[PDB]
Design a binder for this molecule. Structure first.
Ligand SMILES: Cn1cc(-c2cc(S(C)(=O)=O)ccc2OCC2CC2)c2cc(-c3cn(CCF)nn3)ccc2c1=O
Length: 127
């Protein structure tokens, strides 16, 4: 069984930028989530080989995880905060699409998403 290549975390042709909102996203948002007790399943791409999930990447064609998001933020991959917010939403939605209600992973995602939304509610206005 094989995993797909992970989402890119750098791109030679993609313009790069660091905004106050992007800094908040790394320093406050990703920080709060990364250290949460439920963060670890989301800290790297889903390893469908190790987890024996042969259908994972047949169902999930836009994978995303907080390890990828962290590297994108650190590498200044993004132009704006919305791109990063979108990656978080992709991560959460993928979890709800692939998994079933009551699954442990779904309960973990829901908790993390609640914290996520709390933190982005105070996203600072762009300078
Ligand atoms: C987003 N996500 C993440 C993981 C996950 C990934 C890793 S990882 C980074 O090392 O690949 C490490 C632990 C993980 O979940 C741990 C789980 C307790 C909460 C995941 C795992 C499964 C799964 C199914 N079964 C059945 C026996 F195999 N076992 N596990 C299903 C969906 C997901 C998913 O949707």
């Amino acid at each position: 069984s094989m995993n797909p290549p992970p989402p890119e975390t750098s791109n030679p042709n993609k313009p790069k930028r660091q905004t106050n909102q992007l800094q908040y996203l790394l320093r406050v948002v990703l920080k709060t989530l990364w250290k949460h007790q439920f963060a670890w399943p989301f800290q790297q791409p889903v390893d469908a080989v190790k987890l024996n999930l042969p259908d994972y990447y047949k169902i999930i064609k836009t994978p995303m995880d907080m390890g990828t998001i962290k590297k994108r933020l650190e590498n200044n991959y993004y132009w704006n905060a919305q791109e990063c917010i979108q990656d978080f939403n992709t991560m959460f939605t993928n979890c709800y699409i692939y998994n079933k209600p009551g699954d442990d992973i779904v309960l973990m995602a829901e908790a993390l998403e609640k914290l996520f939304l709390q933190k982005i509610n105070e996203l600072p206005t762009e300078e």
